[PDB]
């Protein structure tokens, strides 16, 4: 188009189409159980195009989602819900968007508790799997290093 | 009950971030697990005094000593190396799904998220937060994913039952 | 005292390395004189019998350590067959090799941050690791690597089938 539409976030901030759609539903106070397809499709397309202008990375699913919305819109309008699938998709994704926020808080709260590495008990002196190795290593890379005494 | 709790303190201290299981603790003290637990529970109470800097927590099937959260601003002042980055939103949303819906397949995950989820699955596997828990019985025999004890530890969870309920 | 609790948390997190009076005082934002009072009070508290750790001073360095009276129980912990802090030192080491072989005890202990002298010694005995070469130079430093008896033990067919690590 002729103008540069005003946007806070770049597309990288979104985890795909459902995520973008949930943001728009929020921005324009759309009722999620009763979606104004045309309007939302309009908001969705305008954002995508704006990002495409900036040679940004539009993941594959965004274009698929566009075709999906344009098609739902045509069917409802032209002569010859069709959107209950999409509504249920959104509600489902939203459920785990929120559950993942609660997890994020716990990740942070857990991070505030400091542990020490094990003692070297070699002086005082096995069935394992690939998970046990990955675990041993993740436990190691999680270790914060404190400044050593001078 | 005093020398037993000193011993458990010493054992947990030397076990560090790996912790000890109740049986391990019982086996060293040569007592029943229910007796070990009473010692641990007393030790926990001792650590609850405002005067104490460390606490005994139960994370992921083991007991371990950790600092209290109120002291975190002081501990941070001595951090040169931060350790593991916080998870991406993609990894975190993939993980929430597996946490609540396990065992679950790549397909079902991709269905909920609406995008391909190979990257975050790879991320979570390498952090030992999820593992393969079998194959589904269906045409493609697709892998099922579940969460690990490491998953519980990483999110301050005693057990999966402690997860916040789903909205 | 909240100062005592902070000092215990500091020294606990510091582990075997410990902290100097300068660091503890700098973290508390108080004089070294003031800090040392706190350290002494804490060191006094950890002399009660109900405590399994003590505060020691060793080179202008302060650390928490297990008491020597409890040394036999540390023996029981590692001896009684299971998941001792030793077994995990093996896995930790083995894991660094597998994903970073060919590797040498210099390179490993740089990552672990500890003498892996003993883990390696038991990693040969159970046959899961071996030499792969040397660095042909400074000390002729032994290069360790994974055996094909290690590929078997973990149900792997090749080394390619190791879960890739995106964050490394």
Structural class computed from helices and strand pairing of chain B: alpha+beta
User: Helix fraction of chain A?
Assistant: 55-70%
Major β-sheet strand ordering of chain B: 4-6-5
Question: How widely separated are the two ends of chain A?
Answer: 63 Å
Main β sheet profile of chain A: none
Annotation field: number of helices of chain B? 8
Proportion in β-strands of chain A: under 5%
Shape of chain B: globular
Question: Could you explain the architecture of this structure?
Answer:
- The complex is a heterotrimer, with one copy of chain A (150 residues) and two copies of chain B.
- With 150 residues, chain A is mostly helical.
- Chain A has helices at residues 17-27, 37-53, 60-77, 84-111, 130-142, and one strand spanning 145-146.
- Chain A has five helices and one strand; from the N terminus they run H-H-H-H-H-E.
- Chain A starts with 16 loop residues before the first helix and ends with a strand.
- Chain B has two domains: 1-76, Orthogonal Bundle (Arc Repressor Mutant, subunit A); 77-167, Arc Repressor Mutant, subunit A (Orthogonal Bundle).
- Chain B has eight helices and six strands, in the order H-H-H-E-E-H-E-H-E-H-H-E-E-H.
- In chain B, the strands form two sheets. Chain B has a three-stranded antiparallel sheet. In chain B, strands 1-2 form a two-stranded antiparallel ribbon.
- In chain B, strand 5 and strand 6 (143-147) form a beta hairpin.
- The chains are: A mainly alpha (150), B alpha+beta (167).
- Chains in contact: A-B, A-C, B-C.
- Chains A and B meet through helix 1, helix 3, helix 4, helix 5 and strand 1 of A and helix 1, strand 2, strand 3, helix 5 and helix 8 of B.
- Strand 1 (145-146) of chain A pairs antiparallel with strand 3 (79-81) of chain B, so a sheet runs across the interface.
